[PDB]
Design an enzyme around this catalytic site. Structure first.
Site, PDB file in Angstrom:
ATOM      1  N   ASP A   1       0.821  -1.266   0.000  1.00 12.81           N
ATOM      2  CA  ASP A   1       0.000   0.000   0.000  1.00 12.81           C
ATOM      3  C   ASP A   1       0.838   1.291   0.000  1.00 12.81           C
ATOM      4  O   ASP A   1       0.297   2.366   0.271  1.00 12.81           O
ATOM      5  CB  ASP A   1      -1.031  -0.023   1.218  1.00 12.81           C
ATOM      6  CG  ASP A   1      -0.329  -0.117   2.569  1.00 12.81           C
ATOM      7  OD1 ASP A   1       0.900   0.081   2.587  1.00 12.81           O
ATOM      8  OD2 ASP A   1      -0.961  -0.514   3.586  1.00 12.81           O
TER       9      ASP A   1
ATOM     10  N   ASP B   1      -5.596  -1.185   3.954  1.00 16.99           N
ATOM     11  CA  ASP B   1      -4.427  -1.648   4.664  1.00 16.99           C
ATOM     12  C   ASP B   1      -3.969  -3.021   4.073  1.00 16.99           C
ATOM     13  O   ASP B   1      -4.685  -4.000   4.084  1.00 16.99           O
ATOM     14  CB  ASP B   1      -4.744  -1.764   6.156  1.00 16.99           C
ATOM     15  CG  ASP B   1      -3.493  -1.903   7.027  1.00 16.99           C
ATOM     16  OD1 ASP B   1      -2.418  -1.256   6.793  1.00 16.99           O
ATOM     17  OD2 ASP B   1      -3.536  -2.858   7.781  1.00 16.99           O
TER      18      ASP B   1
ATOM     19  N   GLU C   1       1.971  -5.763   6.362  1.00 15.46           N
ATOM     20  CA  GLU C   1       3.381  -5.508   6.202  1.00 15.46           C
ATOM     21  C   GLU C   1       4.025  -6.704   5.497  1.00 15.46           C
ATOM     22  O   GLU C   1       3.565  -7.850   5.599  1.00 15.46           O
ATOM     23  CB  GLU C   1       4.080  -5.327   7.559  1.00 15.46           C
ATOM     24  CG  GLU C   1       3.743  -4.079   8.339  1.00 15.46           C
ATOM     25  CD  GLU C   1       3.991  -2.778   7.562  1.00 15.46           C
ATOM     26  OE1 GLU C   1       5.085  -2.598   7.000  1.00 15.46           O
ATOM     27  OE2 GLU C   1       3.045  -1.976   7.428  1.00 15.46           O
TER      28      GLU C   1
HETATM   29  C1  LIG Z   1      -4.071   5.437   4.969  1.00 14.66           C
HETATM   30  C2  LIG Z   1      -3.832   6.522   6.022  1.00 14.66           C
HETATM   31  C3  LIG Z   1      -2.889   6.323   7.020  1.00 14.66           C
HETATM   32  N1  LIG Z   1      -2.675   7.279   7.956  1.00 14.66           N
HETATM   33  C4  LIG Z   1      -1.677   7.064   9.010  1.00 14.66           C
HETATM   34  C5  LIG Z   1      -2.389   6.555  10.253  1.00 14.66           C
HETATM   35  C6  LIG Z   1      -1.471   5.482  10.827  1.00 14.66           C
HETATM   36  O1  LIG Z   1      -0.703   6.114  11.878  1.00 14.66           O
HETATM   37  P1  LIG Z   1       0.174   5.320  12.972  1.00 14.66           P
HETATM   38  O2  LIG Z   1       1.455   5.057  12.237  1.00 14.66           O
HETATM   39  O3  LIG Z   1       0.331   6.410  14.034  1.00 14.66           O
HETATM   40  O4  LIG Z   1      -0.613   4.133  13.385  1.00 14.66           O
HETATM   41  C7  LIG Z   1      -0.549   5.081   9.681  1.00 14.66           C
HETATM   42  C8  LIG Z   1      -0.781   3.685   9.110  1.00 14.66           C
HETATM   43  O5  LIG Z   1      -0.022   3.564   7.911  1.00 14.66           O
HETATM   44  P2  LIG Z   1       0.704   2.189   7.529  1.00 14.66           P
HETATM   45  O6  LIG Z   1      -0.414   1.164   7.460  1.00 14.66           O
HETATM   46  O7  LIG Z   1       1.403   2.518   6.217  1.00 14.66           O
HETATM   47  O8  LIG Z   1       1.663   2.041   8.689  1.00 14.66           O
HETATM   48  O9  LIG Z   1      -0.711   6.068   8.660  1.00 14.66           O
HETATM   49  C9  LIG Z   1      -3.422   8.489   7.916  1.00 14.66           C
HETATM   50  O10 LIG Z   1      -3.223   9.389   8.734  1.00 14.66           O
HETATM   51  N2  LIG Z   1      -4.329   8.731   6.974  1.00 14.66           N
HETATM   52  C10 LIG Z   1      -4.601   7.808   6.043  1.00 14.66           C
HETATM   53  O11 LIG Z   1      -5.465   8.083   5.191  1.00 14.66           O
HETATM   54 CA   LIG Z   2       0.063  -1.537   5.933  1.00 19.35          CA
END
Ligand SMILES: Cc1cn([C@H]2C[C@H](OP(=O)(O)O)[C@@H](COP(=O)(O)O)O2)c(=O)[nH]c1=O
Ligand SMILES: [Ca+2]
Length: 129
Positions: free
Chosen positions: A15, A34, A37
Site C-alpha cells: 500500500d 491496509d 506488512e
Molecule cells: C491510509 C492513512 C494512514 N494514515 C496514518 C495513520 C497510521 O498512523 P500510525 O502510524 O500512528 O498508526 C498510519 C498507518 O499507515 P501504515 O499502514 O502505512 O503504517 O498512517 C493516515 O493518517 N491517513 C490515512 O489516510
Molecule cells: Ca500496511
C-alpha cells in the site's frame, strides 16, 4: 475528484509506492486500505501485486479525495490508478488488502472498495481464507 499525472519511481510494499508527483519524489500511502506488512502473512503477495500493477502501467495517475493530502509522516494520501485500474480496488478484490483508515472527508470510494472486499470474503481469498 480528478486524476493527475505521476510516474513510477519505485514500488515499496502493498500500500506504499514512490512516485514522481509535480516533479517531486514522494511516498504515496494508498487511501482506504491496509495491506499486511511485508513481514506478515500475505505481505509479500500484496507487495508483489502492487509492484506488478505499477511497474506494468503505461500510465499512473494520482487522485486526491477532498480531505487531507499528506499524512503525519509526509506521505501523499491518494487513490492510485494504473492504466485506469484503481490499485486499491484490485488489491481488496484479490483479498490482499482490507478496507481501512476510513476517515471523514477522504472516503469517496469506500462503498466501491467494500463491495470488492465482500467478494474476496465470499471467496475465502487470501486474507479471508
Ligand atoms: C491510509 C492513512 C494512514 N494514515 C496514518 C495513520 C497510521 O498512523 P500510525 O502510524 O500512528 O498508526 C498510519 C498507518 O499507515 P501504515 O499502514 O502505512 O503504517 O498512517 C493516515 O493518517 N491517513 C490515512 O489516510
Ligand atoms: Ca500496511
Amino acid at each position: 475528484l480528478h486524476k493527475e499525472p505521476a510516474t513510477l519511481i519505485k514500488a515499496i510494499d502493498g500500500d506504499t509506492v514512490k512516485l514522481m508527483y509535480k516533479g517531486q519524489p514522494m511516498t504515496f500511502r494508498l487511501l482506504l486500505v491496509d495491506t499486511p506488512e511485508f513481514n506478515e502473512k500475505y505481505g509479500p503477495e500484496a507487495s508483489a501485486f502492487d509492484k506488478k500493477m505499477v511497474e506494468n502501467a503505461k500510465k499512473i495517475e494520482v487522485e486526491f479525495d477532498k480531505g487531507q493530502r499528506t499524512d503525519k509522516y509526509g506521505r501523499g494520501l491518494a487513490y492510485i490508478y494504473a492504466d485506469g485500474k484503481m490499485v486499491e480496488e484490485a488489491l481488496v478484490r484479490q483479498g490482499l488488502a482490507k478496507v481501512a483508515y476510513v476517515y471523514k472527508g477522504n472516503n469517496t470510494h469506500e462503498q466501491l472498495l467494500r463491495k470488492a472486499e465482500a467478494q474476496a470474503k465470499k471467496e475465502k481469498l487470501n486474507i479471508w481464507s
